[PDB]
Each structure stands twice: as structure tokens, then as C-alpha cells.
Write a protein that binds this ligand. Sequence first.
Ligand SMILES: O=c1cc(N2CCOCC2)oc2c(-c3ccccc3)cccc12
Length: 127
Amino acid sequence: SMNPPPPETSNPNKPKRQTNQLQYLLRVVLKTLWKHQFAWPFQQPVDAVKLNLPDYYKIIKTPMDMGTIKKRLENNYYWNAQECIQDFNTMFTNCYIYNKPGDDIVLMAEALEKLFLQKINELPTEE
Ligand SMILES: O=c1cc(N2CCOCC2)oc2c(-c3ccccc3)cccc12
């Protein structure tokens, strides 16, 4: 069994820009979720080899994690906030898809998503 290469965090062909929404997503949203007590499983890609989940990357074909998102925000990978918000939502949805409702990992993802939705609710207007 083998893990895939992690998601792209640098691509000079992909257009990108700094925006006030993207800065908020880094300084407020990512920062806040990262320090959550249940953040740790989501701070890097799922290691399906170490966790003995040989079917994980057969079920989850768009993996995402906050380590990747952090790198993307820090390296200004995105064109807009929606691209980043989609990465977060993919991360949560991956977890809800692969696991049964009420599992520990799902509860942890649901906690982060609650804080996520709190923070996106107060997403600033474009400057
Ligand atoms: O969807 C997932 C399913 C799992 N699993 C399956 C159930 O047993 C535990 C491992 O683990 C995940 C982890 C993770 C959990 C513990 C340690 C390291 C990573 C991080 C993010 C998503 C998942």
C-alpha cells in the first residue's frame, strides 16, 4: 500500500492574488481551527499506510487537510476565498463520507466545521 503525493501547494502556471478575504482565511480562520483541541488529525494528509486504511484513497479521490491549506494560504496559491473555502469543505466532507456518523473522527471534524462556519459567517466583504 502507498500514499499518494500530497495535494499541490505551488504551481507557477496557476494565477493567484492576495485578497482581504484570503488574508482573513489565514489570520482568522486557519489560525483559529489549528489551535482547536481536535485539530491534530487534520494538520497533515491522512497517512493511510500508517493507519492501515488501504481503501482510503479508493474512496477519497480528493484528499485535503489543513497542513495543505496552510501551505496554500502562506504561499498565496489561491485566486479567491471560494477556492480556499472549498478545500476546507472537501476536508470535512471526506471525513463524513469515509466514516460512519457518530465516529470519533467525525465528531472531531464536526467540531472544527462548527468553528469554521462561525468564522465564515463573519467573512469580510471584498476590499
Ligand atoms: O477520515 C478519516 C478516517 C480515519 N480513520 C479511520 C477510523 O480509525 C481512525 C483512522 O482517520 C482520519 C484521520 C486520522 C485519525 C487518527 C490519526 C491520524 C489521522 C485524519 C483525518 C481523517 C481521517
